[PDB]
Design a protein around this ligand. Structure first.
Ligand SMILES: Nc1ncnc2c1ncn2[C@@H]1O[C@H](COP(=O)(O)O)[C@@H](O)[C@H]1O
Lengths: 533, 538
C-alpha cells in the first residue's frame, strides 16, 4: 500500500524555480572577465537559464547530450548549470587548468556537443580545436568579438545565442534518475542524476553540515568547474542566499576586497587560495568584519589555519572532505554536544580531522580481505562509502565491476572513531604493510630518484616470510653509470628510519609504463615475487 | 540516459540507523507514567525499535497493516514510531483526548491490528474494547500488571513482547512511496479523515525542517516537543531529531507550566515546541518563580496564531527567539516559518520586530498561493486576501479510503484558511474560513482581534467569535480570561483597540470566563463559544 501524498520528481529546475518565486530580488554579484561587476539576482538568473535552455533545445540536441563548460564562477556559468540540466541535457563541468591532451581526452570521451568557455581560455580552446571532432558549437561566454572569431572560425557567442530562446519556455519533466551532470576525477567520469544532486543539496543545506540561510552572503571560491562547487549553486538556491561569484580574480587582495565590499558571511575555498587571502588580510589590517564562517575542503585543512580564523577573526572553520565520486561531500567537521565538557584546547583539537558524515552517507573501514575493522579511532583500514550521492559506476564503464559488496572504495586508509569522525592517514595503494609499522612507498621513491646515478626508480611491496611485506627497490641505472646495490641502499641512511630502507635492489632497463605514463606496480610485484625469499 | 549513482529508497528506518551509528550515546530523557525518569539514548531506542519491529512481524501482521497508539511523548512511543514504520507497517498515532465514541470510529476505520497505549488510558481502552473487534493485540506500554490484566483479559505487555524479537532483525527494503504512517484530522465537516504519509514524504519533510531558516535541529540542541506525538507526529521532530542526532527531552503526561519550567531547567532544554496555550502556563509560572530559563535559545510556536505579545515576552525577558510557524496535518505539517531575510537587517529595530509576527515564508519543497471564490489566482500583494492553496513533496493528494474524489483544484490542495501573501512570500492568516466573521457586508478577522486583546497585561488570554445581531448578521464578541491578580473593566478592554483596527470592527461587548474551552490539540473551541454565547447581543 502506497502513501497518498503528492509525488513530484526531484528536478534541478525546481531549485531555480523556487529561488525565483520566493527570492527573486535577492542579490547575486558576478565578477566578469572584462573587469566589470554584474549585479543581478535569482530572478534574472532564472529567466536567463530558461531562455538559454530553450536556445539550447532549438539547436536540435538530443536528450542528455553533454554540454561542456570551461568557466570561472560567474553569472553565465550559473545560468548554464540550470539551463543545461533543466532542459534535460548533461551539464559537464571541465577543469580548464588541465593539460591540453587531458582536455582533448575528456572532451572527446564525454562527447560534448556544446562547449561554453570564458575568454581566459580562448587560446587554449583554439589550440586544441582541431582535435575536438564531436563539438558542434563553440560558445564564448560573452558578446561577439572580432579577435576571438579570428582565433576560432566559426565561434558563436553566448549573448547572441540566449536571444534565440523563447521567453515562454517551460521546463520538461522526466524521471528524477535522469542524468544531470558530469565531472571527471586516465580521468574517470562520474555521471550525476537530478535525484542525487538534489538529495546532496538537501543534506548540505542542513544546519549541522554547511547550511545556507537567506541571511547569508555566500562566496564560493571553490570552482564551479570541479565537483559542483561543493553543491553551493544548488544549496544557495534552495535557501535564497545571496552570492558573490569571484570570476577569474582569485588572488588574496581581490578576495579580501570582495568580503569587505559585499559583506561575505560564508566563504568556501581550499587551503592554497586561503593562504593568499590570509596573507593580504594580515598586511592591510582588515577585520573581515562580516565573515562568520568558512568551509575548507579538497585538501587537508592545516590546524594552524583553523586557529588563525578562530583567534584572529572569530571565524569558525568547517573542515570538509569529499571527492568527485561523492558529489562531493562525504564528511564535515561540526562538533557534538558532549565535546563542550572537555577542556577548551582539546575542543580545538577535535576540529582538525576531516569530520563526521551527514544522513545520506555511510562510512566504514575494512582490512585487506574486505572485512570490517573497529571504529575505535586508532585502527587503520581502507575507507569504504555508500549513500544517495555516491556513484554506482563510472561513465561508459558500466561493465567493469567497481563496487565491493555494495560499497565504493575511496582509495584512502583512514581511522573512524565511534562518532564517525574520519582521519585521512595514507593512500591504500601506497602502503607496504611491514610487520612493526607500515611504509610509504612513494616516500622511498622520492629518496631513491634523487640519487645522481639513477634515471628513475620504483618501490614495491614484496612478500617476506617473517615481516609479511618488505620494500624492494626497482632501479633504472642512469645513463653511463654502474651504481652498486650497496651504495644505493646506503644513500637512504639518515633520510628515513633504517628499518624502512628497502631490503634489496634490482636493476631493469625501463619501468613498465602505462599510456597514462605512470608505473604499473602490479607487474613489478608479479615479476619480483620471490626477491626476498 | 539515467545517471550512474547508487539508488536507495528514502526510508524512515535509515533515519534511526543513522542516529544509532553516529549518535548512539546522545542522550534522550523520558518522563514515564510510572513517576520515574528514564535516561536513554539513540542507540538504545534503535536497538529496542529493531527488536519490537521483529516481534510485531512475528505476530503475522501483513505489510502496511496499521499499528495504533494512544500515548504520551516517551521512549516507548519513539521506539514504536521506528519499529512500526521500519518493519513496513503504518504507524497510526491516535489522539487520546477525543471522546470514546470518536476513538471507536477512528480505530475501526483505520483497521488497526495492534493498539499500544499508556497506563493513563487503561480505563478508556477497557471501556471501548468490545467495540474494537479488529484489534488483535492490546499492548500496555509497560511491564506485566495484574490489575491491568483484570481490566483487559488477554492484555499483552510491551516489555514482554519486545523479548520475543530477534536480536539480529534486518529492516525490510521497499519502495519509498510505501505508506508509512496515518493521522486523522477532523473539524468540519463530518467524520475525521485520514492523512496517509509515505517514507519518501517523511524523509523529504525532515530534510527541509533541518535547514537553518525553518527549524534546523542540531547535535548541540536539547529538544523538547510539548506538541504531542499524536499531533502530526509532534510536528516531525521525532524524524528531524534522528536525522541530526539531537538530544531530546520527552515530557510524558505532565504538561502544565510548572512541569515544563522544571524540565527546561533540570535538563537544559535549548529548543521547545508547542501550540500557544501550552506557552501561557509556562510563561505564567516562570514569571512567578523567577527563573531565567538560562538554557532556552528558541521556540517554535504554531498550530494557532502566536500572539505578538508572546514573541515580545520571550525576546525582551529571556533573550529567546520565537519562530512562528504554520502548517497542517495534511502538510506533514510544516508550511511556513518566520525567519528574516537579508534586507531586513537595515530596517529600524521596531519594524524588524513587527515582521516576525506573521506565519512566515516557505522553504524549498512547498508552494503557496491564494485564489478567490471562483478559484482564480489573486495578487500576492500582502493586502488582498483569499483562500490559501498549497502543493509540494509533503502535501496530501487524497484522504485515506477516499482516493476516489476530486479533492484537489487544478493540482492544489485547499487549506480552508483565509490569508494574504506578500511579494516576499510571507503568509498572514486572516482566519479559518469556518471562524471568519461577516458583519455589515465585510469580513472581520477574529484572529487579529483576539491577539490584539491578548496583549493587554490584565488578560491572560482571550478569543473573539461572531454572534448573531439583527442588523449586522454577525458582530464580534470578546471572550476574556482575567490575569491571575487582575480585575480589568470591560470598558478599558475595548478602548485598548482604539487606533489598532477600524472603529466598526472593535468587539461590541466583553464577557469574562475563568477559562477558554480547548479542543483536543490545545486550540480554542470557538464553535462551543459561539453556541454558548449566541445570545450575548440579542
Ligand atoms: N501559526 C498558525 N496561525 C494560525 N493558524 C494556524 C497556525 N498553524 C496552524 N494553524 C491552523 O491549524 C490548521 C491545521 O490544523 P491541524 O491539522 O489540526 O493541526 C491550519 O489549517 C490553520 O487553520
Amino acid at each position: 500500500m502506497l502513501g497518498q501524498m503528492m509525488t513530484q520528481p526531484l528536478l534541478i529546475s525546481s531549485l531555480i524555480d523556487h529561488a525565483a518565486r520566493y527570492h527573486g530580488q535577492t542579490e547575486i554579484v558576478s565578477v566578469e572577465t572584462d573587469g566589470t561587476v554584474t549585479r543581478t539576482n535569482w530572478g534574472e538568473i532564472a529567466a536567463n537559464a530558461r531562455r538559454m535552455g530553450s536556445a539550447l533545445t532549438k539547436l536540435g540536441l538530443q536528450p542528455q547530450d553533454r554540454i561542456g563548460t570551461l568557466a570561472w564562477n560567474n553569472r553565465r556559468h550559473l545560468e548554464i548549470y540550470y539551463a543545461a540540466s533543466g532542459a534535460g541535457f548533461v551539464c559537464h563541468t571541465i577543469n580548464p587548468r588541465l593539460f591540453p591532451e587531458q582536455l582533448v581526452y575528456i572532451i572527446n570521451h564525454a562527447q560534448d556537443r556544446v562547449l561554453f568557455f570564458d575568454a581566459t581560455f580562448l587560446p587554449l580552446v583554439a589550440a586544441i580545436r582541431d582535435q575536438l571532432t564531436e563539438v558542434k558549437h563553440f560558445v564564448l561566454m560573452g558578446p561577439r568579438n572580432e579577435d576571438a572569431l579570428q582565433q576560432i572560425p566559426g565561434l558563436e557567442f553566448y549573448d547572441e545565442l540566449i536571444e534565440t530562446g523563447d521567453t515562454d519556455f517551460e521546463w520538461p519533466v522526466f524521471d528524477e534518475n535522469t542524468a544531470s551532470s558530469l565531472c571527471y576525477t586516465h580521468p574517470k567520469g562520474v555521471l550525476y542524476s537530478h535525484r542525487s544532486t538534489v538529495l546532496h543539496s538537501f543534506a548540505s543545506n542542513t544546519r549541522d553540515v554547511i547550511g545556507y540561510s537567506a541571511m547569508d552572503v555566500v562566496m564560493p571560491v571553490v570552482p564551479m568547474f570541479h565537483v559542483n562547487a561543493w553543491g553551493s549553486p544548488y544549496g544557495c538556491a534552495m535557501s535564497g542566499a545571496q552570492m558573490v561569484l569571484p570570476g577569474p580574480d582569485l588572488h588574496g587582495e581581490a578576495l579580501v576586497n570582495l568580503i569587505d565590499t559585499y559583506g561575505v558571511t560564508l566563504a568556501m575555498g581550499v587551503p592554497t587560495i586561503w593562504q593568499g587571502l590570509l596573507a593580504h588580510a594580515a598586511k592591510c589590517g582588515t577585520k573581515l568584519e562580516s565573515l562568520e564562517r568558512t568551509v575548507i575542503g579538497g585538501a587537508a585543512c592545516p590546524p594552524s589555519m583553523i586557529a588563525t580564523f578562530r583567534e584572529k577573526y572569530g571565524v569558525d572553520t568547517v573542515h570538509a572532505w569529499g571527492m568527485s565520486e561523492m558529489s562531493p561531500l562525504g564528511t564535515a567537521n561540526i562538533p557534538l554536544a558532549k565535546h563542550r565538557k572537555l577542556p577548551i584546547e582539546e575542543q580545538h583539537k577535535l576540529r582538525e580531522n576531516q569530520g563526521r558524515p551527514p544522513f545520506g552517507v555511510e562510512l566504514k573501514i575494512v582490512d585487506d580481505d574486505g572485512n570490517d575493522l573497529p571504529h575505535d579511532g586508532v585502527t587503520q583500514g581502507d575507507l569504504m562509502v555508500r549513500g544517495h550521492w555516491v556513484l554506482d559506476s563510472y561513465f561508459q564503464l558500466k561493465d567493469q565491476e567497481l563496487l565491493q559488496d555494495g560499497w565504493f572504495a575511496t582509495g584512502d586508509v583512514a581511522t573512524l572513531d565511534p562518532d564517525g569522525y574520519m582521519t585521512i592517514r595514507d593512500r591504500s595503494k601506497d602502503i607496504i604493510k611491514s610487520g612493526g609499522e607500515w611504509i610509504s612507498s612513494v616516500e622511498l621513491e622520492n629518496i631513491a630518484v634523487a640519487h645522481p646515478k639513477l634515471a628513475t626508480a620504483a618501490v614495491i611491496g614484496v612478500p617476506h616470510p617473517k615481516w609479511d611485506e618488505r620494500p624492494l627497490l626497482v632501479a633504472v641505472k642512469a645513463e653511463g653509470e654502474d651504481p652498486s646495490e650497496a651504495e644505493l641502499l646506503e644513500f637512504f641512511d639518515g633520510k628515513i628510519a633504517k628499518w624502512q630502507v628497502p631490503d634489496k635492489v634490482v636493476f631493469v632497463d625501463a619501468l613498465p609504463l602505462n599510456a597514462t605514463g605512470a608505473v604499473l606496480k602490479r607487474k613489478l610485484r608479479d615479476e619480483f615475487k620471490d626477491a626476498l625469499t
